[PDB]
Structures are given as structure tokens and as C-alpha cells.
């Protein structure tokens, strides 16, 4: 399966630098042209740069022509992309993409965040929250993430295996600080029967916890 | 450069019915020489990069169900979904990959219309872990309603409170077409404990009378 | 006047095709642009064959027309080629520019 | 306006030698280089080709070891080399190459003419082949190279006049006059061989 | 390999009639095209082949009417409507189909057809300067016979070389030498008479 993984994401102070990784697998990485394609928060798609399978045809967007440079390993099969003179519009989950005939651009990768702030990496305190002393056929349980920063944290119920009725909000921005909560809705036969657990990861702070729901007492 | 135009930016429909969506380009984008119209369409799905629909204007791509179909020449192309699911809900972007640089246009967001649904609403108390950290958030669920515009009220001892809530909404489920919003109270632990009651009140367009969930400590 | 618009359009297609394509698991030729034809990743001991160029301003009076290129058994490819098909309808008579042009492109 | 231009050679038995075939009027790096093999009044035999830009060569399964074929890509120019030359080599070798786009050999150059010998320019000796109509004629036997040009009394005897093509290590030709016998001898007939190679000419009038 | 065999090896003619030649290959050439890789060349006396027609029977650039290319599977014929003197020479045949390697006829030499005609032989001893320096060499000239299949024959096989003129301009002729204690030394020339022409020296 065609698999493209990006990785170096994270806070960049204004105006510094910050390289991005691509790892790819599942074909030839040495026959095919790359691509970097951003996307500001909750914004459209826009192309940055492209650069063939041997780098002799490199591409920039004009916004990004001499402070970004795309480049290649085709040996270890990884794309690059260095950013220098960063600004806050360049604030954008960053992808990278294959094509496929007959289009330009075909297999997306995950993405990863770039946030461009001057504010500090803050670890986040996760909290159970389990319900009153008052009580149906369905229990709603929740987890607290508050207080971290940048953006994201990738919050998950029981490993991943408890999935189906499951929300997490969107993180609010409070004095350069964010903060969100996840739901899940479990019917009463299971919890507190059997266990629920919340893990929440920042990946800026390398930050992994987690938080079982444990009845009040 | 292209300039890419899409329309409706916003749409909304039942489960199962047919939908159309615009998209032009300010040049023509048929290579007359094979003949063939370089728009490709996408999907992106919230939370998800996006996923390759159709290329060269018409030509679905593998695994593509039969309900997608794009169609047009020139300037003016068109995408049909025909018996929209609830896990269409997604943002629809068309892409020059005529010439460089390849553009996006601003996408066409589909939304999904169902019938009214009632919020579960679900409040929890601080946590122990949080008040013997030195804080005291108070977070109320509103679980599986629509429409999706809703107000919460919070009162503390029959007195209604604005400062210190932050209220955050989830996308559209993509299962039940429902939404989801979180309310959360910040105060000091100090403040917390010099009051008793707590109740988040929400006032949804399927009652006139609220719906009330307190606890007591 | 100038078709030489269509032939770098052409090869570049071509040269699009190939940083977007897969190339096959195996011994095969190498798809790639001889000037005159794009021509695909071709199996060994197989005579690779494509329509005629639309960059040829005769182009739609032989649409149908195929070119030929035996592709070697050992993934390279032959001399061996066959043009025919796409040549000039009337050959020398007028036409001369691009036919002197097009046997540049040689 | 494509060309092909390759020198005839001269070489000793058992060395090598190698054949020209200079290319021009087309990008040369375009076009595989042919050769073959011909001895006049015979079949065509092809050698092999080669592809000048990467030096790529197939040969026919009868001239390996006998056939290396070389491109030097800076003068365009193609060559082709036999080693341990034999007798079986006297023959001309042509280097040919398709029609652009096609299969078949549109372009020819004029060959070059392969003599294997191990001798220097050696003059011949000429002599009288003497006896209504009488046939008289010269023996131009031992010459070495090709070729001899051989008139009658300075061109004045030209019908009636048969030359044949010589033969090999050094060449032997004859030539034929028919003269009534009415003439003969009471008129002069003299064969006249020119061998330019050597700066040889020879008058031998024929006497009873 | 392919093999082209040719027939007639020599067709003879005369000028304006209509000529054709025919060749045959051991396999088919009808490639996977669908069409058919035969080619014919011309060599005319001590020049290279120039090509006449490809794919059977398509002509090549500045060729003329006359010459018009028939044949499918492993049969093929090259018609000369009207034979002028230009279109003499040894005719090839070439397949591209099966390559490597590429394989060609035999050949055939066009020529002239006139009226039969006898040889005229005659004999040479050795010249007194050959004996001067040590060598001898016999001479028979069958000359002027007509067609050129002949035979040698010498009564005294070892140490007999033959050398065939080509076809004379002026007559449409064929000449041929043949040359080489005894007495009476003799050539034997058999042409299509009944009994040898005996030319013989004592």
C-alpha cells in the first residue's frame, strides 16, 4: 500500500527554521515526482513546491520561492522540505504527495503541523471526568486536556479499541493556551464493569498519559 | 496563474438524494492535443487529508464508488453525487493540474440534513485530580442533536454565569449526522468552593423548556 | 505556422507520464521520449507500440496509425522501428518546413 | 543529405585492421551503425550493428570473434574490426544504416575493398601470348596492387579487346585482342599495362 | 535464420520488355504487424545496393513506375514493366522480419538476352620470357560465347584458374580465360554444339 509519513512538526519561533521528513513506502520511490502541499487552519489546499524523481525539475510556489527548499534522498526514500524566515501565515498542516497518472497529485500523506508562534511548548494536565452521584441504558464519560500548547494532542479511548461514539472537540485558544475535552458514551453494562481508559499524546512536549475513569468517590 | 472557482462554497442535503457541485477555471484547462480536461477533484474528509476522486475531469479513480462522477470540458466542470451517505460529509475541493502552479479552489463543503434530534446532556463536576491540582473546570456535554445551533446557560446557585465559559463544537457526524457541543466553567478553586449548585441549562429548538443538569458540592 | 508548440507539449506529457507512473515488477523497457513518440514501459521480447504523435500536423488523417519499437529481451531497446503508418499521406510534396523541421527532431 | 564515407585497405595475413565509416548530414547518435560483409558476385552477409550512444553491439552469430565493433562519438564516425585476418576476408565492407523511423537499409556507403596479402607493391611482368581472325594477348601476372588499366597500341585497338579481372598473394589478369588475320602480322599490335601503383609502364609488341 | 532464396539466379531480357524476379523466405515475414518486412535492393557494377522498394511493395524515394513489388506470406515478385538500361544489375532481396540477423537472396543479375551464339577458343603455350625467369603459364581464350554457362576442361584439373568477363556492352557477349616434359596440351569448351570445341597445341 502506498504510505507517505511526514514528521518534524511543531512550534517554530518567528523567522527561525524548520525542516520536514517524508517517509515513503509501498513503491518506487526513485521513479516518481514529489510534492509538499499546505493547508492554513481551516482553510483551502495550496501547492508548495514539487521536485522530480531526479531532482532536476524543482517547482516553488511564489510565496514561498527563496526561503523554502524541496529535496530528496532516493536512496532512503524520504522527501524533504526546509523552511527558513518563517512567518505565522505559514502556520499550515504540511502534506506530502505522490501522483499517479494521469494527475499530478494523487497519494496524501497524514500531514504534519506547523505552528509559527512566539508563546513556549506547554505539557497539557488530563483530567477523568466520570458522572455525579446522579443516573440509563447509556453512561457518558469524559477527559479533560487543558492548558497546552502548540496544537496538536491526539486523544483515543481504551488503546483505540472503543472508537464508535466518540467526541473530541476542537481545542479553544485561550491567552496562548489550548484546551479541549473528549466524550465517550458507553452503555452502562460495561463501565464501570470494565475498564475505560483515556490516553492523550502531545507530541511537542512528548507528553503520553493515561487516564483511567474511575467512579466517584 | 489558474484561478479556481467552486460553487456552492456551502451545501446542504438529506441522506440519499442527488447533488451537483460547480467548479470553473479563469483558462481552459483541455489540452487540445489528446483532448483531455486536467481538473481532478478531491475529497476531505474532517480530521483526514484529502482522498483523490476523479482525474482527467471523468475518470474515477480504484476503489471510487460509482456514485462520484465528475463531468465537463473547457471551464466548466461538475461533480455528482448521486444518493449521498452520511459519510459523504466532506469538503470537495477541484484542482488545476493543467500548468504550474497547480491551484485549488476554495471547495465545496457538503452537509448533511436529518431529523431533529434532542441533546443528551451530561455535567461533571471537578475532578478530584484537578481540585487537589489547585483548579476547578466545570464541563457539560451536549451529546447527538440537531440543528446544530443550541445555547447552554450556566448558573451558579440560581445565578446565571457568563465570564470564564468557552464553548466548542464537533463537526458533523459522519454515521448519524448529528452534532456535538462542549461547554466548559473555569474558575478558581477558591471560587469553586464558596458556592453549591451548578447547573448548565440547554435551550435547543426541539423544546421550549431547557434541559437541566445540576449536582451539588 | 509554428507546430513547434505541440511537440514540446508532447514530450513533456511524455515526461509527466513517467514521474507518475509505476514502473512494472521485472525485466522491461524503459518508457521514455525518443524525440519522436512517448513510448510506455514495454515487457522484453515485445514489439512496444503506441498511436501516432498529435503533435504531427497530419495527425488526425492517420488517428489510427500506430508507431513500432521492439523492445529488446534484456530491457533495452532495439533498432528495429516502424514509422510508416504515421508518415506524411503524400510525402514529398508540401509540408516541407515541418517534414525539415520534424527530421531534425531525428 | 545523409552520407556515409569509408575508405580500399590493404593488410597482412593474421593482423588486424580497422574500417572507417564517418557519418554526416544527421545527428549520429539518432541512428544504429550497420555493416556488411560483401564479396562481389556473391550474397550480402550482415556483420552486426551498433548503437553509437551507449556503444550497445549485437552481432550475427557467424562474425564474433572475427568482428569488434567500435563508435567514436567526437568525429561521428563508426568502425568495425577483424582480427586474424584469413583469405576468406578478401571482400568489400559496407557499412549501412536504416531509414529513419523504419527497418530497412536506406543508406549505403561505397565499401571498402579488403585485399589480404603480405606483399609491398611489386610491378608485373607483362608478356606475349602469341599464337580469318587471330586472337593475340598480353599476361599481366604477379602485380601487387589492384589496379591495371591495359590498352592496344595506345587505344587505337579497342573492339575485340577483353580484360578479364584479376585474381589473388599477388594479382594475375589476361587480356585479348582479336585481329583479322589479314592484319596480323603484317600490322603491329602492342599491349600497353600501366601499373600506377608502381610507376610501371610496359610496351609489348607480340611477334610471331 | 531466414533463408531467401532467389530464382532466376540469372533472368536474362532485353530492353522494353517486362521483366519480374521472384523470392521466396524459409518462414513467413507477416509480423505481428499485419504487414510484411521484405525489401528489395539494386547493385549495379561496383557500387553498393540502393533500395528499391520496402514492405513488399512500396516504393522508395525517387524510383520509378516500372519497378512494382507483389507477394504475401513466403512468396514475393519485383515486376520491371519496361526494361531500360539503367535497371541491369544483381537484384537483392532483404527481410527485416526475424532480426537479428538480418538475412538477404542470393542475388540475380538482369542481363541481356540476344541470339546463341559458339565460342571461339584458342591456345597459348608459355612466352620465352616466362621460361626465362623460371615460369610457365598455358592460356585458353573461349571468348564471345553466349549464355555464359560454360565449362573448362583441360587434358595434359590441378592448377587451373578461371577469370569470366562481364556482359560485353557492344554484343551482349561473355568471354572467359583459363590458365595454367608434355607434348600436347589442350582446353575443352562444351557450350549449348553437341561435341566439344577442341583447341589443342603440340
Known amino acids: 500500500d502506498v504510505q507517505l509519513v511526514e514528521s518534524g512538526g511543531g512550534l517554530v519561533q518567528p523567522g527561525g527554521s524548520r525542516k520536514l521528513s517524508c517517509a515513503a513506502s509501498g513503491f518506487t520511490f526513485s521513479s516518481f515526482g514529489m510534492h509538499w502541499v499546505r493547508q492554513a487552519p481551516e482553510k483551502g489546499l495550496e501547492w508548495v513546491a514539487y521536485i522530480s524523481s531526479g531532482s532536476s525539475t524543482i517547482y516553488y510556489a511564489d510565496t514561498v520561492k527563496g526561503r523554502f527548499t524541496i529535496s530528496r534522498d532516493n536512496p532512503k526514500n524520504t522527501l524533504f522540505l526546509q523552511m527558513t524566515s518563517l512567518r505565522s501565515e505559514d502556520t499550515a498542516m504540511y502534506y506530502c504527495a505522490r501522483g499517479k497518472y494521469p494527475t499530478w497529485i494523487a497519494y496524501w500523506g497524514q500531514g504534519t503541523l506547523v505552528t509559527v508562534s512566539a508563546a513556549k511548548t506547554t505539557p497539557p494536565s488530563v483530567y477523568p471526568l466520570a458522572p455525579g452521584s446522579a443516573a440509563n441504558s447509556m453512561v457518558t464519560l469524559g477527559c479533560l486536556v487543558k492548558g497546552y500548547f502548540p496544537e496538536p494532542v491526539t486523544v483515543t479511548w481504551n488503546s483505540g479499541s472503543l472508537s464508535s461514539g466518540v467526541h473530541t472537540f476542537p481545542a479553544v485558544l485561550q491567552s496562548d493556551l489550548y484546551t479541549l475535552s473528549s466524550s465517550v458514551t458507553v452503555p452502562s453494562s460495561t463501565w464501570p464493569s470494565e475498564t475505560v481508559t483515556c490516553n492523550v499524546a502531545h507530541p511537542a512536549s512528548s507528553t503520553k498519559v493515561d487516564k483511567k475513569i474511575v467512579p466517584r468517590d | 496563474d489558474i484561478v479556481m472557482t467552486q460553487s456552492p462554497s456551502s451545501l446542504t442535503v438529506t441522506a440519499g438524494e442527488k447533488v451537483t457541485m460547480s467548479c470553473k477555471s479563469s483558462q481552459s484547462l483541455l489540452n487540445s492535443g489528446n483532448q483531455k480536461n486536467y481538473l481532478t477533484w478531491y475529497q476531505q474528509k474532517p480530521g483526514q487529508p484529502p482522498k483523490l476522486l476523479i482525474s482527467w475531469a471523468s475518470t474515477r479513480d480504484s476503489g471510487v464508488p460509482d456514485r462520484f462522477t465528475g463531468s465537463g470540458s473547457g471551464t466548466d466542470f461538475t461533480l455528482t453525487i448521486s444518493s449521498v451517505q452520511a459519510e459523504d460529509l466532506a469538503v470537495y475541493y477541484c484542482q488545476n493540474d493543467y500548468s504550474y502552479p497547480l491551484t485549488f479552489g476554495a471547495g465545496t463543503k457538503l452537509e448533511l440534513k436529518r431529523a431533529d434530534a434532542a441533546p443528551t446532556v451530561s455535567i461533571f463536576p471537578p475532578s478530584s485530580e484537578q481540585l487537589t491540582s489547585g483548579g476547578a473546570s466545570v464541563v457539560c456535554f451536549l451529546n447527538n442533536f440537531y440543528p446544530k445551533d443550541i445555547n447552554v446557560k450556566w448558573k451558579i446557585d440560581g445565578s446565571e454565569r457568563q465570564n470564564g465559559v468557552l464553548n466548542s463544537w464537533t463537526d458533523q457526524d459522519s454515521k448519524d449526522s448529528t452534532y456535538s457541543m462542549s461547554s466548559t466553567l473555569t474558575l478558581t478553586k477558591d471560587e469553586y468552593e464558596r458556592h453549591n449548585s451548578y447547573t448548565c441549562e440547554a435551550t435547543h429548538k426541539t423544546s421550549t423548556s431547557p434541559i437541566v443538569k445540576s449536582f451539588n458540592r | ?106
Not at chain 3, 40 to 57: E, G, H, I, K
Not at chain 3, 74 to 88: L, M, P
Open chain 3, 1 to 106: 505556422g509554428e507546430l513547434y508548440q505541440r511537440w514540446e507539449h508532447y514530450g513533456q506529457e511524455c515526461q509527466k507520464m513517467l514521474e507518475t507512473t509505476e514502473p512494472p515488477s521485472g525485466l522491461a523497457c524503459n518508457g521514455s521520449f525518443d524525440m519522436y513518440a512517448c513510448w510506455n514501459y514495454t515487457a522484453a521480447n515485445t514489439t512496444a507500440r503506441v498511436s501516432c504523435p498529435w503533435y504531427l500536423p497530419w495527425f488526425r488523417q492517420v488517428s489510427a496509425g500506430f508507431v513500432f519499437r521492439q523492445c529488446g529481451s534484456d530491457g533495452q531497446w532495439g533498432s528495429w522501428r516502424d514509422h510508416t503508418q504515421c508518415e506524411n499521406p503524400e510525402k514529398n510534396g508540401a509540408f516541407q518546413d515541418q517534414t525539415l523541421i520534424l527530421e531534425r527532431l531525428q
